């Protein structure tokens, strides 16, 4: 597990797991540690209801750029295990959720 | 709302299948695709697979085909079974949905798109610990 670090108000600009192949559809999700995991970025601009602005993905247009998740002004209850679900085109299906990310606010 | 209740049984034996249930009352007809996601000490979420209308639920490669699924109408629930317990199998079973959604990056008719399953609304989960 992935450890990460940073500070209160900063942008946390968290990496994915493995290489973006083709089309990309991540699915960003925040496990609490106990509770139910929680829907951030469906395809890779889109977010679900009660999830403010501050989390946002990359859109993939004209493919290049790395699937990150940008989170702008993080508080201490959102800190929590993170997961980044790589849908693609020259893998076929996706059965892992790839490499889970630990983000830590210091304070 | 999507109410999911988990009835599970939690102290489970080797050589024994699973019970753990989720009852879904509500907006669920046919188009929610309900799923099956764990969580280890230390192994990340599994996504151990999904049930649709087209009853062909397809499972993991690492799960080495040892779970039958059941959702039934009558009984109006989706249950799990697990047959051959490890001890590295004290996860947190949760019943969630899903929304197989397309992505198109070319002509639909040459089999240009293919789909992902994005999980909105979770449950509760129940801690089955494997006790040998």
């Known amino acids: 597990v992935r450890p990460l670090s940073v500070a209160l108000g900063e942008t946390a600009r968290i990496s994915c797991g493995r290489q973006a192949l083709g089309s990309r559809a991540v699915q960003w999700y925040q496990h609490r540690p106990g509770q139910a995991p929680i829907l951030l970025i469906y395809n890779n601009q889109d977010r679900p209801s009660g999830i403010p602005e501050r989390f946002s993905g990359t859109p993939d247009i004209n493919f290049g750029t790395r699937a990150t998740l940008t989170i702008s002004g993080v508080e201490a209850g959102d800190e929590a295990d993170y997961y980044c679900h790589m849908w693609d085109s020259r893998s076929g299906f996706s059965w892992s959720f790839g490499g889970a990310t630990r983000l830590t606010v210091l304070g | 709302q999507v109410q999911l209740q988990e009835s599970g049984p939690g102290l489970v034996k080797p050589s024994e299948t699973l019970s753990v249930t989720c009852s879904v009352s509500?907006?669920?007809?046919?188009?929610?695709?309900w799923t099956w996601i764990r969580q280890s000490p230390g192994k990340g979420l599994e996504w151990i697979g999904y049930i649709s209308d087209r009853e062909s639920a397809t499972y993991n490669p690492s799960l080495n085909s040892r779970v039958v699924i059941s959702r039934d109408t009558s009984k109006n629930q989706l249950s799990l079974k697990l047959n051959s317990v490890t001890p590295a199998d004290t996860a947190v079973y949760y019943c969630?949905?899903?929304?197989?959604?397309?992505?198109?990056?070319?002509?639909?008719?040459?089999?240009?798109?293919?789909?992902?399953?994005?999980?909105?609304?979770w449950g509760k989960g129940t801690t089955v610990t494997v006790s040998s």
């Open positions: 509500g907006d669920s007809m046919n188009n929610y695709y």
């Open positions: 969630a949905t899903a929304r197989r959604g397309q992505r198109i990056y070319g002509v639909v008719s040459f089999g240009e798109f293919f789909y992902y399953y994005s999980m909105d609304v």
